[PDB]
Write an enzyme that holds these catalytic residues in place. Structure first.
Site: not given
Ligand code: TPP
Ligand code: TPP
Ligand code: TPP
Ligand code: CA
Ligand code: CA
Ligand code: CA
Ligand code: CA
Ligand code: CA
Ligand code: MG
Ligand code: MG
Ligand code: MG
Ligand code: MG
Ligand code: MG
Ligand code: MG
Lengths: 524, 524, 524
Positions: A24-25, A27, A46, A69, A280, A400
């Site tokens: 991003g900008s 960086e 990210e 960023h 767990h 987890g």
């Molecule tokens: C979470 C996050 N990561 C990175 C950035 C940095 N970001 C600023 S604009 C941009 C480019 C976005 O590209 P696109 O959506 O294709 O639009 P364009 O700029 O080509 O019109 C980036 C990566 C951000 N703002 N937010």
């Molecule tokens: C970020 C995040 N969100 C939600 C959960 C809850 N999570 C525990 S296991 C699970 C189901 C995952 O399903 P899948 O990958 O299809 O495997 P399965 O359980 O069907 O073998 C969820 C949503 C988590 N652990 N982490």
């Protein structure tokens, strides 16, 4: 020299040559004039950046450097940091900040109160008070991540700092070495050794810090000398022991009662490189039944303090495992007999049982394959059915948090080009960090992704049983076409709707030159 | 009554009937026996969950309720929370915690030091000290989100609390009403009105809290009475004024110098519902040139305190805008002349200029369309080329965090079924929250997604010019097939490689019954 | 101009001319060349510095400016900040930091992670990223402290910043005014007024924000028009109402059951400028009995959110009290009967009953005396026996933290030279901030200190009764000679061992030119 030049010199002198990032900008003044001896690995979100870096750090057993960023980029990575904290992953997370003069007006892209943003998931978090001391702050970050217990750190850098002159004393930072390779003093070590030698029925439990330290072979020697059964501690993020070694007794269920039942009758239980314990599920009972002394060796004071039972020693796992393995007597007790081979589950010509998938992987994959698991309902079967002989052969989200395995598998494969990485990921889990696939395509990193598609969050149906929870919304995820997602990000897409197709698709994937995704239709 | 029953009663009595979530074990005791008068909206990753809820809250002008899984789920949503903070979005973020007895041993899925995790991106963050007081904590959360300045809040609830008995005095919580609908006292309001009435060349600047308050029409009246030009404050998250009204002068560039030049010559500048100011790019100069007095009306003390110039009044935007519009005199000055129509840019039979895309959208979309913008290099042209006559017609990531528009467009469409939502999203931005597409397919929410595909992070190329940054890695994102990604998540996928195809695809998408994604080939 | 010069100009233009401090090296670059139109008030320990500034701010109804030394000075003041938070005291707390170049090495007197140190007891806490923007950060601090709800703020300034060049646009900061003087919109205000007019048996409860706003007279008019009894909310930090007015019903006991019993039979209870409610002791029961509606007007969103019952309005207390007083109808009901005169307790020629002390003070003190209370076991009697007719006549530690009254009495006396301050302080409480006495002697601030010496922490003996706590250590404090302590710090010291000596010593003290301490022998 500039802060930019000095900081890259510090990084290269400290062994870093890779930047994992989403730019991003704020960086651009850091990333400009990117040195020829560095490589940048772009990921599209990210959580993916950090997951890739995490896999790379865990497999390489060295710190990984990340550039995100501001607040939004850091924030998108915080689930990934939760896993990194639990796996003790040495991650240096840098984020670009607005110019110093704009922070107080809170211009767009200001990271407000930045040091507090990633807490409590980092060991250290800081925003330098002056541009000239940015290299010192980076040095502090590198060492804070790398010292035991390893873990993620955060540094926020105002973007106008990079073009400023560095403190001319910065060169003293370049070659600093910090050691945490310590072990218990001789007098107390000799006492511990006598306690192990005196035990009539010892048991050993190993956690992820064994594999991080590459202490696996020393633990094999220790187990053989003591003639002791060996378990892996629950909720295992890594595999610390050869899973078909005769002493191996498998993964402990993550339940209080389940574990105290396993340990009953063992007069001394030696836990190495694990929390005591990462329970767990709800599974109430005794932490530890009478007649058992527990001794824990951990690299992490926080683990030692919070254990509900046992003595603890805070030291380096590598150094302690090596010392114990070489000091204990060879017991004349009978060596344990290996666990029996898993039974073959019958497989008709329809949807695949997970047991079939693991048996087929074990039959076909190289013996030094590296597996990642984010197939949450099938973990027990995975541990029973995959022979993992070598260190560094297994990763599972240490906190987890789903969204780890898909990107981490790419980072592991980047770190270990000589070992085939195979990520076994459920249909639900695959979505959290799906865009990481693009990085495998773009950099031609030949990870194999095996998607276990049963249309549901299956493990949550199991927990619903344990917790007696009915009429719960949100447990089914129908209507995802993983071959189309793979095509979307440029990754070759195969299908396996029956056993014959599974065998063919795996044969092909193992012969491929780039990444491959296999969508497996598994039983509900 | 149980904490579960009492909490759902509090929620329904406070007007909440929708839960946006991604489930996990710690949330099952909350989600079980889900009541028939509530609906659950599943999304596949937590940045998507929060983005959808955020769009819903902003469009509905009422709080949205979110349920996430412990630290990992909360962490995955923190980038989304950064945007919500800046947009003053009333989001009630709940996360399930481990059982009280397990927090101390730090069992898997313990959210350690939970209240600190989302800081500094929330107004209030809390973990209750007892099960019986969970309804009280939820009441506090609801009101903290909803009071001016609105914003996200966080509540962590141990999963064993839901089945416990609630405090029997909890019923006093159900019908509590808290008002922040306040305005300046009569004496000081009359002083402000006189200052406006006697200004010789007033100007008005409006921010997103005008649209949040639905104060747009009152601001039109105020501008007409004062015969004053009207700008939208920089980095605009919402549209507070009809963009083809004769007073309208457009979006202010997010630059210090740019803005002081626009306001030069205006003796009184009245800012309503904006920070002073959300600058972005490096653009040094004066904050405010001599001869101009600035008066800011803001709902947020933090905005008032940090402004580098001007007087400020902290009050409700709706109440203040209504009072001012009805109290000021009708000036006899000439009404401002409308801005000229934008020029039609040359367009051949190949890839689309963004100007062509916006002109075509403006020609074809209904007058009450709602646009979302995450096409970061094309914002100035978007504001010039779309006639947005109504409130609630524009959303852009308020903290600049990508991954907002795609999910938020789904939440906006859910809130406003009678208004066609059209999200204009760059190829880069689309990836951050790509999995949100699935929620639109599953719930048949008929959002139109227009992907502007130019193969690069184009806005970062522009910043690299301003910052004189050469040899920057990571700026190109070749090899993404958006029609395949849409197919992956069950959303109809159309292409537009030239103007004729753009016209056809838009005609079709406007006649569709479900969500539609259009991949537009735009110029690099 | 320098940061030093610009910062003092900002302070003077914002109405600040006094610095309360205890100096150290990191503050010398700020304090040097101290302007001739400013005054510095030294106290010997930082709890005393902050308490003096707090009394001065509360009595003056304007912000007070504090300068402390790094972490150790800030830390010594944190108990005082806890009281300031609860009293909504507008305190600008500045602390000197090490030079920017030494913060990262953590030189001695580095305030590590400085912004986090005073949390959660401040509204805002900040360390500037650049010297040039220190005046902007100071502006932010001034307005954050001064905007409703007022409270303490913290600014940490590296000592090398003061000599640097200030942003030349800093002059826009000098005359900024921010108003929070707001009240409920007309429509909803008229609804509230109608509810008050229609009440059959209203009651009014007033808190400290009434006295802070000088809304006392408006509340008297409101009570007279509604013919309503008036209580002061529990744990009262200030006195918001004339205590011998016929509507006055006294201080509410700080118990849940006690308060709902007092409010029983009142159909509408209007609470103004108080938390709902600042309970203290264990006294379980109903928050509110059926048949009572509660409406709270508060300047603090945090108060409105956490009330377990009632509707709330977040607005300026001065503006709302004036509006309501002038809009409500005159009720046809009878004015409440004045509370009877307190009974005279039997008093022999020995040690003094506290009731005797308060009766004697009431007989002898001027009608515009200002009292402070830190005689913890005698608060109820003090409220019953002192006729306080005027605003600004009473202060008590708002968070219950001892060490407030002795220093605060000096700051109140400094703020109000025409009103005699009389602090009534227990022998236990006197010790927490004993060194504040020196500041009274040095600056000849003529506070009268009445030490109630009964040799014990008497209130804790009462709590031990409630909590059924026997064999508790540490409740007695024999062997303190307060006349010697007073001599130690240069304050005239008198004794009162019986009633005739009390009368004589008070007559003398009221005729003195400097501060006087009277040690009163009270019953145990
Ligand atoms: C979470 C996050 N990561 C990175 C950035 C940095 N970001 C600023 S604009 C941009 C480019 C976005 O590209 P696109 O959506 O294709 O639009 P364009 O700029 O080509 O019109 C980036 C990566 C951000 N703002 N937010
Ligand atoms: C970020 C995040 N969100 C939600 C959960 C809850 N999570 C525990 S296991 C699970 C189901 C995952 O399903 P899948 O990958 O299809 O495997 P399965 O359980 O069907 O073998 C969820 C949503 C988590 N652990 N982490
Ligand atoms: C800083 C601080 N420490 C301890 C306490 C607890 N405190 C409650 S009242 C009290 C006794 C004070 O005794 P004294 O001032 O002699 O008055 P008495 O109770 O005898 O009337 C104590 C120690 C407190 N409130 N604040
Ligand atoms: Ca030794
Ligand atoms: Ca599944
Ligand atoms: Ca693009
Ligand atoms: Ca009004
Ligand atoms: Ca006492
Ligand atoms: Mg195939
Ligand atoms: Mg945080
Ligand atoms: Mg008024
Ligand atoms: Mg603190
Ligand atoms: Mg004398
Ligand atoms: Mg005497």
């Amino acid at each position: 020299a500039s802060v930019h030049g000095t900081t890259y010199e510090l990084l290269r002198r400290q062994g870093i040559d890779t930047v994992f990032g989403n730019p991003g900008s704020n960086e651009l003044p850091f990333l400009k004039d990117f040195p020829e001896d560095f490589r940048y690995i772009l990921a599209l979100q990210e959580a993916c950046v950090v997951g890739i870096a995490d896999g790379y750090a865990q497999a390489s057993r060295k710190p990984a450097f990340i550039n995100l960023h501001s607040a939004a980029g850091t924030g998108n990575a915080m689930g990934a940091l939760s896993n990194a904290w639990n796996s003790h992953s040495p991650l240096i997370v840098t984020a670009g900040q607005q110019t110093r003069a704009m922070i107080g007006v809170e211009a767009l892209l200001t990271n407000v109160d930045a040091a507090n943003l990633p807490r409590p998931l980092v060991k250290w978090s800081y925003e330098p008070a002056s541009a000239a001391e940015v290299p010192h702050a980076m040095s502090r970050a590198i060492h804070m991540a790398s010292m035991a217990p390893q873990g993620p750190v955060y540094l926020s850098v105002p973007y106008d700092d990079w073009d400023k002159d560095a403190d001319p004393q910065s060169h003293h930072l370049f070659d600093r070495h910090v050691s945490s390779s310590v072990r218990l003093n001789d007098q107390d070590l000799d006492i511990l050794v006598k306690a192990l030698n005196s035990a009539s029925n010892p048991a050993i439990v190993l956690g992820p810090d064994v594999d991080a330290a590459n202490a696996n072979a020393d633990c094999v020697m220790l187990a053989e000398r003591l003639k002791a059964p060996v378990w892996v501690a629950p909720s295992a993020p890594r595999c610390p022991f050869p899973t078909r070694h005769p002493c191996f007794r498998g993964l402990m269920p993550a339940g209080i009662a389940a574990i105290s039942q396993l340990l009953e009758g063992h007069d001394v239980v030696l836990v190495i490189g694990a929390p005591v314990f990462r329970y767990h599920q709800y599974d109430p009972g005794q932490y530890l039944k009478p007649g058992t002394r527990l001794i824990s060796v951990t690299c992490d004071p926080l683990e030692a303090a919070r254990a509900p039972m046992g003595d603890a020693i805070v030291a380096d796992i590598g150094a302690m495992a090596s010392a114990l393995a070489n000091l204990v007597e060879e017991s004349s007790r009978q060596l344990p007999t290996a666990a029996p081979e898993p039974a073959k589950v019958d497989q008709d010509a329809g949807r695949l049982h997970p047991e079939t998938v693991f048996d087929t992987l074990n039959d076909m994959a190289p013996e030094n394959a590296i597996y990642l698991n984010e197939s949450t309902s099938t973990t027990a079967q995975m541990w029973q059915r995959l022979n993992m002989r070598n260190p560094g052969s297994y990763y599972f989200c240490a906190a987890g948090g789903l969204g780890f395995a898909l990107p981490a598998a790419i980072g592991v494969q980047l770190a270990e080009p000589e070992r085939q990485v195979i990520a076994v990921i459920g249909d639900g889990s695959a979505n959290y960090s799906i865009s990481a696939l693009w990085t495998a395509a773009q950099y031609n990193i030949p990870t194999i992704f095996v998607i276990m598609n049963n249309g549901t969050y299956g493990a949550l149906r199991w927990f619903a049983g344990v917790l007696e929870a009915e009429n719960v919304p949100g447990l089914d995820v129908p209507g995802i076409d993983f071959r189309a997602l793979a095509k979307g990000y440029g990754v070759q897409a195969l299908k396996a709707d029956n056993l014959e197709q599974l065998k063919g698709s795996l044969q092909e994937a193992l012969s491929a030159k780039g990444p491959v995704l296999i969508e497996v239709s598994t039983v509900s």
